[PDB]
């Protein structure tokens, strides 16, 4: 029914701007938060009011009690967490509810439930979703790992159960690599995610990363919005994403999409979320993780379905019914998203600290840009290296590639190194154009790293 009067965006950069835009289109006043080093940030200038908080640049966005209190002081009725920072923090979501503030996301018990990677696999198994073979929970000790490895069969995978962003993932091809990499990844988790909890699963060979988008309202209406292929990756982090995948047929799209919809109804999911799968070389999908939040790559799904995911998050959070049924969801054409990161591909994607000098954003038919940058934007060590997301749409796959290549060739950024020259070479690459890429794509195509300056 009634829309929020005021929403506080507990995030920064391009996802803050994305949420602020959806709010402005809905007529909601907005509140930004920022650290002193970002007094000139774009999200600060776009919001109707903005507040400088935190004792360091991360504490600005990670201090739940302070952010909830600021919400109350200024009269914000809801909080959008974006992605990262506190978006999948169940204590933050629960604190909002206790205080009368609507968290724009799923219910906090669902966040808690799906926040442990092992537990969410067990939940999805019981709901009928095929999952990657592995441990059924945390690993007690490395003896337990030595056993189960033998059970699943090498090569296996060690994964931080409280992990994210690609951190805490080490492959193990024998029990000698296992024990070493066990200490290697364990210490790495106590210090990185707060919990040393490691799980184990089968390493699937030459895999593709396939993920389904769900969207549900507070009245049990859940739909899926098709899938994305996010296989091109560095440090187990996505670089290029496409929708729909090229792998799946329309009939498999609807089948797997019905399974995730069924499972999301079972756990009582509403708002936006995504179920991530690994596709084996035979093309069978196994569930690995759920993100109970918007994802970076949500725009490619919006471009082929016509559905504004972030704006539906906010409407849903205010109690609006989801005005679609599944039969209404069509998958028109193809969309590609490239992450423009401030890092240097030829030096192992080392971050590129500095200041943007020249900056020209392309535009045109079928081009969308998600960004928060201008000349003078400083790349700092504190935050994700993402500068912009370039997104294109076309009716045919090959036109979408050509459109993306031509958009990247016109995207001028100087003062820091970026991924743009690498991405241009990927668009020119025969295999990519033919649809042949796994998660090992960069490893198997070293010539995409050959470019000038």
Q: Locate tokens 């699943």: which residue?
A: 152
Q: Using CB under 6 A as the criterion, which residues of the chain lie in contact with ligand ADP when the complex forms?
A: 83-84, 88, 132, 157, 159, 163-166, 169, 201-204, 207, 209, 233, 236-238, 276, 278, 288-289, 291, 295-297, 384, 439
Q: Measured from the CB atom, is 119 or 368 closer to its own copies?
A: 368
Asked if 244 and 199 count as a contact pair (C-beta separation under 8 A), the reply is: no
Q: How far are the Cα atoms of 219, 340, 354 from residue 416, in angstroms, in the given order?
A: 48, 11, 6
Q: How far is the CB of 322 from its own copies (least distance, A)?
A: 16
Is residue 358 a contact point for its own copies (CB under 8 A)? yes
Largest CA distance in the chain: 60
Cα separation, 13 vs 32, in Å, equals: 11
Residue of 279, 131, 262, 139 lying closest to 204 (CA atoms): 279
Residue of 181, 215, 394 lying closest to 298 (CA atoms): 215
Work out what residue 37 binds among its own copies, ligand ADP, none; the CB cut-off runs from 5 to 8 Å by kind: none
Q: How far is the CB of 269 from ligand ADP (least distance, A)?
A: 17
State which residue has the least CB distance to ligand ADP.
164
- Any binding-site annotation on 453? no
Is residue 283 a contact point for its own copies (CB under 8 A)? no
- Rounded to 5°, the CA angle 361-363-369 comes to 65
Tell me, what DSSP letter sits at residue 345?
G
Cα separation, 244 vs 229, in Å, equals: 7
Work out what residue 297 binds among ligand ADP, its own copies, none; the CB cut-off runs from 5 to 8 Å by kind: ligand ADP
Exactly one of 42, 234, 253, 293 is catalytic; which is it? Answer: 293
- Judged on CB neighbours under 10 Å (0-12, 13-18, 19+), 140 is exposed
The token pair that represents 101 in the structure block: 């503030």
Cα separation, 40 vs 186, in Å, equals: 39
Q: How far are the Cα atoms of 273, 344, 372, 420 from residue 452, in angstroms, in the given order?
A: 40, 12, 27, 12
Q: How far are the Cα atoms of 395, 396, 404, 433 from residue 399, in angstroms, in the given order?
A: 7, 5, 8, 10
Q: How far are the Cα atoms of 231, 260, 300, 322, 396 from residue 304, in angstroms, in the given order?
A: 19, 19, 7, 18, 12
Residue choice 10, 31, 46, 426 for contact with its own copies (CB under 8 A): 46
Is residue 21 a contact point for its own copies (CB under 8 A)? yes
Work out what residue 320 binds among its own copies, ligand ADP, none; the CB cut-off runs from 5 to 8 Å by kind: none
- Rounded to 5°, the CA angle 153-154-156 comes to 105
Work out what residue 203 binds among ligand ADP, its own copies, none; the CB cut-off runs from 5 to 8 Å by kind: ligand ADP
Q: Measured from the CB atom, is 285 or 388 closer to its own copies?
A: 388
Q: How far is the CB of 56 from ligand ADP (least distance, A)?
A: 16
Work out what residue 430 binds among its own copies, ligand ADP, none; the CB cut-off runs from 5 to 8 Å by kind: none
How many amino acids of this chain bind its own copies (CB under 8 A)?
41
Is residue 375 a contact point for its own copies (CB under 8 A)? yes
Cα separation, 291 vs 293, in Å, equals: 6
Residue choice 143, 281, 328, 412 for contact with its own copies (CB under 8 A): 412
Residue choice 37, 62, 152, 361 for contact with its own copies (CB under 8 A): 361
Is residue 25 a contact point for its own copies (CB under 8 A)? yes
Q: How far is the CB of 234 from its own copies (least distance, A)?
A: 25
Active site residue 293: yes
Q: Among residue numbers 286 through 315, which ones bind its own copies (CB under 8 A)?
A: 299, 302, 306, 308, 311
Report the DSSP pairing between strands 78-80 and 102-103.
parallel
Q: Measured from the CB atom, is 277 or 377 closer to ligand ADP?
A: 277
Work out what residue 197 binds among ligand ADP, its own copies, none; the CB cut-off runs from 5 to 8 Å by kind: none
- Any binding-site annotation on 117? yes
Site residues (CB under 8 A) for its own copies? 17-18, 21, 24-27, 42, 45-46, 299, 302, 306, 308, 311, 358-371, 374-375, 395, 399, 402-403, 405-407, 409-410, 412
Binding-site annotation, residues for ATP: 117, 201
């Amino acid at each position: 029914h009634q829309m929020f009067k005021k929403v506080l965006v507990a995030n920064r950069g391009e996802i803050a701007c994305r949420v602020i835009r959806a709010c402005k289109e809905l007529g909601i006043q907005t509140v930004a938060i920022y650290n002193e080093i970002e007094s000139t940030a774009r999200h600060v200038k776009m919001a109707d009011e903005a507040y400088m908080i935190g004792v360091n640049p991360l504490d600005t966005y990670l201090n739940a009690e302070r952010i909830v209190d600021l919400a109350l002081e200024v009269g914000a009725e809801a909080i959008h967490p974006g992605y990262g920072f506190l978006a999948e923090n169940e204590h933050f979501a629960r604190l909002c509810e206790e205080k009368g503030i609507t968290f724009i996301g799923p219910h906090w018990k669902v966040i808690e439930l799906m926040g442990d990677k092992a537990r969410s696999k067990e939940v999805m198994k019981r709901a009928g979703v095929p999952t990657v073979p592995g441990s059924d929970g945390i690993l007690k000790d490395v003896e337990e790992a030595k056993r189960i490895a033998k059970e699943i069969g090498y090569p296996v995978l060690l994964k931080a159960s409280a992990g994210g962003g690609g951190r805490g993932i080490r492959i193990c091809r024998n029990e000698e690599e296992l024990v070493r990499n066990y200490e290697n990844a364990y210490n790495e988790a106590v210090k990185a995610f707060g919990r040393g909890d490691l799980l184990l699963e089968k390493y699937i060979e030459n895999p593709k990363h396939i993920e389904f988008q769900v969207l549900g309202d507070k009245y049990g209406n859940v739909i899926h919005l098709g899938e994305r292929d996010c296989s091109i990756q560095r440090r187990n982090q996505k670089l290029v994403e496409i929708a729909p995948s090229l792998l799946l047929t329309p009939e498999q799209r609807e089948y797997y999409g019905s399974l995730v919809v069924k499972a999301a109804k079972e756990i009582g999911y509403y708002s936006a979320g995504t179920m991530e799968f690994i596709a084996d070389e035979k093309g069978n999908l196994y569930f690995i993780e759920m993100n109970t939040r918007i994802q970076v790559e949500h725009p490619v799904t919006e471009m082929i379905t016509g559905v504004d995911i972030v704006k539906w998050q906010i409407r849903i959070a205010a109690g609006e019914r989801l005005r679609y049924s599944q039969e209404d969801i069509r998958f028109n054409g193809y969309s590609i998203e490239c992450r423009i990161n401030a890092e240097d591909p030829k030096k192992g994607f080392a971050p590129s600290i500095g200041t943007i000098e020249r900056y020209y954003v392309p535009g045109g038919f079928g081009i969308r840009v998600e960004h928060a940058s201008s000349k003078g934007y400083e790349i700092t060590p504190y935050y994700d290296s993402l500068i912009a997301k370039l997104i294109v749409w076309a009716p045919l796959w090959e036109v979408a590639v050509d459109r993306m290549r031509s958009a990247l060739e016109t995207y001028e950024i100087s003062g820091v190194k970026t991924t743009i020259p690498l991405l241009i070479n990927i668009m020119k690459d025969k295999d990519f154009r033919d649809g042949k890429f796994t998660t090992r794509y960069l490893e198997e195509h070293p010539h995409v790293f050959d470019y000038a300056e």
